């Protein structure tokens, strides 16, 4: 009980937790939770896009 240990978990629960975390992270910086638009994710995807673009150039160079 009480969720102790390392028991298995459902994909519905993974996104569930990840949503409560995003909402709380927003509360610490914007002090509100209405979230009409969610800038937290938009700013994160821009980093993931930059990292991915850098790796693509390496494959091009490696192939050359």
């Amino acid at each position: 009980g009480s969720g102790y240990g390392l028991g298995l978990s459902t994909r519905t629960q993974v996104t569930g937790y990840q949503f409560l975390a995003r909402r709380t992270a927003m509360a610490l910086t914007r002090w509100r939770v209405r979230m009409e638009i969610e800038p937290g994710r938009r700013q994160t995807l821009a980093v993931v896009a930059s990292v991915s673009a850098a790796l693509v150039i390496c494959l091009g160079a490696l192939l050359w």
């Binding site: 969720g3 240990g5 390392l6 978990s9």
Partner: protein
């Protein structure tokens, strides 16, 4: 390191994102066994130089 983990893991709490992550470590470990065993047996070199 094993004795430490055996004593601490049963009384702590972990969020679903980490529990899901420890699960996938097993599948990532099974997948490379066959491609590596054939490399050790020199199969890829033997065929390419049939």
């Amino acid at each position: 390191a094993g004795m430490a983990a055996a004593a601490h893991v049963p009384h702590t709490i972990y969020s679903p994102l980490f529990r899901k992550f420890v699960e996938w470590i097993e599948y990532l470990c099974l997948m490379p066994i066959f491609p590596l065993a054939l490399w050790l047996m020199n199969v890829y070199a033997a065929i390419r130089y049939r």
